[PDB]
Design a protein around this ligand. Sequence first.
Ligand SMILES: CCN(CC)C(=O)c1ccc(N)cc1
Ligand SMILES: [Zn+2]
Length: 140
Amino acid sequence: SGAIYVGNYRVVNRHLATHNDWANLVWEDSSRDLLVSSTTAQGCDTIARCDCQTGVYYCSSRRKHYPVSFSKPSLIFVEASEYYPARYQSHLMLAVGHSEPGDCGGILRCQHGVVGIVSTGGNGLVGFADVRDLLWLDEE
Ligand SMILES: CCN(CC)C(=O)c1ccc(N)cc1
Ligand SMILES: [Zn+2]
């Protein structure tokens, strides 16, 4: 689990969104595994605006931060999940590293701020849902 808090926005994995997330929906994309809900409290997190391909992610299944190299956001096919059908995910970045079902929402960050959240795992790979193209997160 995990979320991004920027301004009056909460970013979570779409498959982990709560009833309150959906009751306060700003935006969701099934193809990206993202949902954004509105918050009353102001968020502190800064979204990276950059093309970094290196950063650090939090891995809850190891209680560790790992530095990773990752691919640019792409349409990637993702193998079977106990949350989704095996299918295409857009705006996904892959790295070599550890990711298990509870690692979703772990934040990937570079020097510019938050890059994305853990969305996929298995086969020694970790997939991150990119948020850097969501420029609208930085106003209203
Ligand atoms: C997580 C999906 N879900 C119900 C399981 C909802 O978002 C939900 C929220 C408000 C509501 N009146 C009805 C449904
Ligand atoms: Zn960066």
